[PDB]
Structure formats: structure tokens, C-alpha cells
Design a protein around this ligand. Structure first.
Ligand code: 5GP
Ligand code: 5GP
Ligand code: 5GP
Ligand code: 5GP
Ligand code: MG
Ligand code: MG
Ligand code: MG
Ligand code: MG
Ligand code: MG
Ligand code: MG
Ligand code: MG
Ligand code: MG
Lengths: 166, 166, 162, 161
């Protein structure tokens, strides 16, 4: 079912270990806020927060498509004012959702707003949103694992692999 | 110096979760196992647990606030005929757990069990059956590894007791 | 697109003023719980038709597959432990979105539960108390009811034609 | 304990404003979308829509607080390329309405204005209001959709204390 392993568990964990310090050094009297959209990046944000050597807090959101604009099924539980926000994504490509999210959050008057992603694809050029932190640059091929799914499966994989068309 | 004593090291937690996964994996062998977690104390635990379980598992989240209790974000899929494992972080009063268990059973899943990381002594009063317990601990307010005090100390890798000054 | 009208404003509003009478007799304040949004137009006129002090509690609902599972989008703002609860619905077919709610509300343990519809249909699983109109298994739109979103603002209820 | 606006005054005004909006929205196959916030203005919407001749469109939203507010219930449909009328119960001090504006125009509607029933005097805030039903004074008032600790909504008239 998994054709090939794009990134092993140890490779992923070593990269996040690097990201943690890089993020930590930049944000080094309130805690850094990690904001994640359910649920492709829960494994990533749980590892990333532990990798960040400065105190960090969690906030989750749940959105849905309308069928560039998304429906909010679950909003933030806290006001964002004067807080350093770090949006945490799993995969960014033709992601207009991220574009919408950055605008929706900056309207709430954060003190800062950056974006960190584990995976970036070549089609992320067509998105209007800056990304300060990128784990890996991968091809456009459909990958699953480490939070990434295909019909809600393969999320529990600890590595990132490529699907065979089945 | 916010933490007085350390209760459970990162090694103890990791080693325990590896055992649970094995135990859970052996008990669940014929769809996929369904892990349901209520936001957001048991997010770190459920991300580490799923990876420890040697059978295919899926994630499902439910955000909920108190008034018995209010639903802010229901499940993203019907759980009819599914083997459901409720994943909690800490149980003592267990009033919310008791409701959640009843609310899920009324959706008629094939199987329903509960797995918690910590269990405090006051959990003997609540009439909820728990199939898997990571650790039994005294009746002290602990923090770390998902657990919070005013949204802080969740990103800690270990579990400790909070100093009286805080 | 209404082929013909069988129920109009004067006929509906009068019955709704008659429904409130029965409710006033049979019934601190009364809670009207309604599912958005095909029955919103009916509740609003019902509360004013009831002499005793009533109240509103709204509840948004989506769905999964079909056969009677229900996803919750909003749900009540308050608890209803031991209180006057009257479910207000718009249409009742062989659909069990109604008692899923009553079961969902019974579990919260109110004092009294009672349902109430404007228009019932030849299909019936719960204690349906106060029935407004008994209509055949035909098309129904108007007065809150809809077909893809529209025909809600109508003061009457007409029949669509396929 | 007081009477500000009679049920006759309220019902007569709504009909006259339904006339105001009925002939100002008359090219597009879409309808006028009535977007409102629970749970105060929910009685106005039912009477306002029937007062408006052109086919209209109900849409609701639930909002909590922390003008910073939180969405508990969102819109079912996207309002892109749509004529939207925001209907509010009472407009006073809260930047709740200004937020709803800056939030809905980001959905890029074809047109966006607001129709409120009552109007407090300090509602000179943000985004000016297209249509007004009654210019009320600066006093806490209930009745007709308005409430105090969840009540007096069943009233068909508007009265103080
Ligand atoms: N599993 C997986 N999901 C992806 C990948 N790239 C983007 N996604 C996410 O999965 C979605 C696929 O659904 P669609 O693009 O058809 O709406 C994307 O919109 C994005 O949210 C990927 O490489 N693997
Ligand atoms: N962080 C932390 N949370 C706890 C502990 N014991 C109970 N809780 C959680 O705290 C909540 C109840 O506390 P309350 O909000 O009523 O003071 C429940 O969500 C419960 O699971 C604990 O020892 N540490
Ligand atoms: N508007 C309208 N709704 C109906 C009628 N009969 C039943 N309903 C309700 O509306 C649902 C149909 O909406 P749909 O599932 O097509 O979005 C039914 O499952 C039932 O809950 C009717 O005659 N007219
Ligand atoms: N009944 C009534 N409610 C009002 C009036 N003005 C504002 N409100 C509502 O009462 C709420 C009071 O909370 P606030 O936002 O003022 O802290 C407002 O947000 C608004 O929803 C009024 O004149 N009469
Ligand atoms: Mg994503
Ligand atoms: Mg996906
Ligand atoms: Mg919990
Ligand atoms: Mg907590
Ligand atoms: Mg209905
Ligand atoms: Mg309908
Ligand atoms: Mg208001
Ligand atoms: Mg109020």
C-alpha cells in the first residue's frame, strides 16, 4: 500500500529538533502561541512544541469547505491580542485555506504572526502567504503518514510515505 | 521554579505508552480502531499512543465546554459499528468522562472502551469502567505532558507537581 | 413555482393562535427548543400566541449519512436540568431526527418533554402531543419551509410541482 | 414596568420598511440574503421577511464573547457574489456589528448593508446603518426579541424595565 518511504521517522524527528531551536532562538512576557487546524498537523505540533526550548501554548481550530473561504466549526478559545502567534501546518501547496487563516488571525490584532510548515510543495508559489519555517521541500506527489491521510487513514504512521494508486 | 517535584519522567511515560500500545494492539485484531480524544489535554498522549499501537488507528476530536456539558465541536464522522477507544489524560471526578461514554454508546458503536494516562484516587467514586490505565497517582494537582494550569506547562515532556506559589 | 395553495396566512395564524391556547392551559418560564431553521418562522409566532411566559433556545444541526444519526453544530446555550421543555418542529415524516433530539434532551433530564409540529405527515416513534395540520405525503414549502434555501419568507404554504 | 413602542407601532413600521427595501432590490437570479445573529433579532427577521415583497433568504450566526468575538455557529453558505442584509436587534456601543461587517465583506459579497430595528444614540463604532426602524433613547429596554437574563422575549411590544 505504501510504495516508498519519502522521509523516515528519525529523519523527521531530527528535522523537528532543528526547527525547535531555530524557532526558540527567534522568540527568545507571555508564551508563544502555536495555532493548528485539525487534524493533519496534530502529531507535528505535539512534537514541535516539545522541540521548542521556550514555553509554548496550544490552540486548535476546525474548518470545513463550502460545497478560498472556509466554514468555522470550531474557533479559538482565547483572544489573540498582543500575542506572538505561530501558525503550524502539515502541508502547504495550493493552500488558499492558509491564506484565509493568516488574514483571519491578523485581524484579531496579534503582536506577531508567522507560519511554520513541515512540508512544502512546488505549487506553494501560487499561494499568497509567507512561510518563515519549512521542514522539508517535497515533490507534488501525494504522500501520507505523520498526520497526513487518505480517507482518514495512515495518519498513525510515524514516517511519511508515498501511496501506490490503490 | 514553577514545578516543585517531578512525578513521571519522559522515559517513564514513553516506556509506559509503548506497553499500552502493545496491550491495546493485542486486544484489537478483527475497519480500523477509532481513537476519540476530547480537546485538548490528551493531544500529546493520543499522538504518542497511536504511534505505539501496532494496528491501524484513526483520530477523532471533540471540543466541549462546561455549563451536564456543552458540545462546541462534534465528531466528523458517524461511529456506528466502529470499535471506539476513548482516550483521556486524567481521571478523578470523571463526570465529563461518564457523560462522554454514554453519549458515544447512544451512537451505537461496535465496541467502547476507555484508556487514560493518569488516574487519581477519587476515580473510584465514578462508575466508569476503564480498560487501560497508564499510571495511578496520588490526589495532587499535576501538570505537564498535555496537562495545564491556566493553559501553561502543556509542552513539558514530563509530568510534575505544581508549586504552591503558582 | 407553487402549483396551488392549500394553506394560507389567515388559516395558519389562526390555528397557531389556537395552538397557543392549549399550551397556555396545559402549562420558571417555558422553554421552546427549535432546530434551525425550517421551524424558526413558526416558533416566533407561537411564543407570542402563548399567554404564559415562554423562551427561546436554538440548536443548529448537520447530518452524517442517513439511517437517524445527527451531527451537532451549535447546541443549547444553557442546561435544561429540570425545566419546562417543549420541542417545536416544522415537518414530521418517517424521519427520526426528532427523537434523536428527544433522547438527546431526555438524557439531560428535564422536568417535562413534549413535542409540537405545525404539519404532520402519514408517518409515525415519539410522544407527539400537539399536532397542527395533518397533510398528505405531498410536497411542502412556505412559512419557514424551503426547497434549496428559498420559499422561506412566504406567509403561506404552497405545493411545488416537479 | 413601562411602554416604549406599541405592537401597533412596531408592526406598522416593519411593513413600511419592507416596502423601502422591496423596491430597492429590483438582474440577479439570487435573492436578498437576510443574515442575522442569535438570539435577539430572531423575531424581527420573521416579521421583516414577510413585510418584504421580493423573495428573501434566511441566514443565522451564533456568537460568543472573550470588538473581539468568537463564532459558535458559522454561515451554512458562502456569501460571495451575493446581496446581503445584516439585520440587528439593537445597535449601541458594541463593535460586534463592525466586526461582523469586516468579517462578512472578506467573504466578498456583491453588496453589504445593515438594517436595524432600534438605534441607540451613541451609535454614530463603525459602518453606518442603511435602514432604521426606531431611534430609541439611551436606556436599557426589553421586549420584542430583546432580553434581560434570558426573558421578556415573548413580549410583542417594547417596554423599559
Ligand atoms: N495526504 C496528503 N494531503 C495533502 C497533500 N497535499 C495537500 N493535502 C491536503 O489534502 C487535501 C486534498 O483534498 P483536495 O485537494 O482534493 O481538496 C488538500 O486540499 C490539502 O488540505 C499531500 O501531499 N498528502
Ligand atoms: N492539569 C490538570 N488537570 C486536571 C487535574 N485533575 C483534573 N483535571 C481536569 O480539570 C478539570 C476539572 O477542574 P475544574 O475546572 O473543575 O477546577 C477537568 O477537565 C479535569 O480533567 C490535574 O491534576 N491536573
Ligand atoms: N421543506 C420541506 N422539508 C421536508 C418536507 N418533508 C420532510 N422535510 C424535512 O426536510 C428534509 C429534506 O431536506 P434535505 O435532506 O433534502 O436537505 C427531510 O429529511 C425532512 O427532515 C417537506 O415537505 N418540505
Ligand atoms: N435589551 C437590551 N439589550 C441591549 C441593549 N443594548 C445592548 N444590548 C445587549 O446587551 C448586551 C450587554 O453586554 P455588553 O456587550 O454591553 O457588555 C449587549 O452586548 C447587547 O447584546 C438594549 O438597549 N436593550
Ligand atoms: Mg492542513
Ligand atoms: Mg487529508
Ligand atoms: Mg481531558
Ligand atoms: Mg486544563
Ligand atoms: Mg425541521
Ligand atoms: Mg428543508
Ligand atoms: Mg445585538
Ligand atoms: Mg441580551
Amino acid at each position: 500500500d505504501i510504495k516508498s518511504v519519502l522521509l523516515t521517522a528519525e529523519q523527521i524527528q531530527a528535522r523537528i529538533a532543528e526547527l525547535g531551536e531555530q524557532i526558540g532562538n527567534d522568540y527568545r512576557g507571555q508564551d508563544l502561541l502555536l495555532i493548528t487546524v485539525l487534524k493533519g498537523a496534530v502529531l507535528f505540533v505535539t512534537d514541535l512544541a516539545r522541540a521548542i526550548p521556550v514555553p509554548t501554548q496550544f490552540e486548535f481550530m476546525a474548518v470545513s469547505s463550502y460545497g478560498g473561504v472556509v466554514r468555522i466549526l470550531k474557533d479559538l478559545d482565547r483572544d489573540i491580542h498582543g500575542r506572538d502567534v505561530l501558525i503550524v501546518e502539515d502541508v502547504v501547496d495550493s493552500g488558499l485555506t492558509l491564506s484565509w487563516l493568516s488574514r483571519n488571525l491578523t485581524s484579531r490584532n496579534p503582536r506577531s504572526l508567522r507560519v511554520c510548515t513541515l512540508l512544502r510543495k512546488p505549487d506553494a508559489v501560487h499561494a499568497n502567504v509567507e512561510i518563515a519555517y519549512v521542514g522539508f521541500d517535497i515533490p507534488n506527489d501525494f504522500v501520507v503518514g505523520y498526520g497526513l491521510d487518505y480517507d482518514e487513514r495512515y495518519r498513525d504512521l510515524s514516517y511519511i510515505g508515498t501511496l501506490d494508486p490503490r
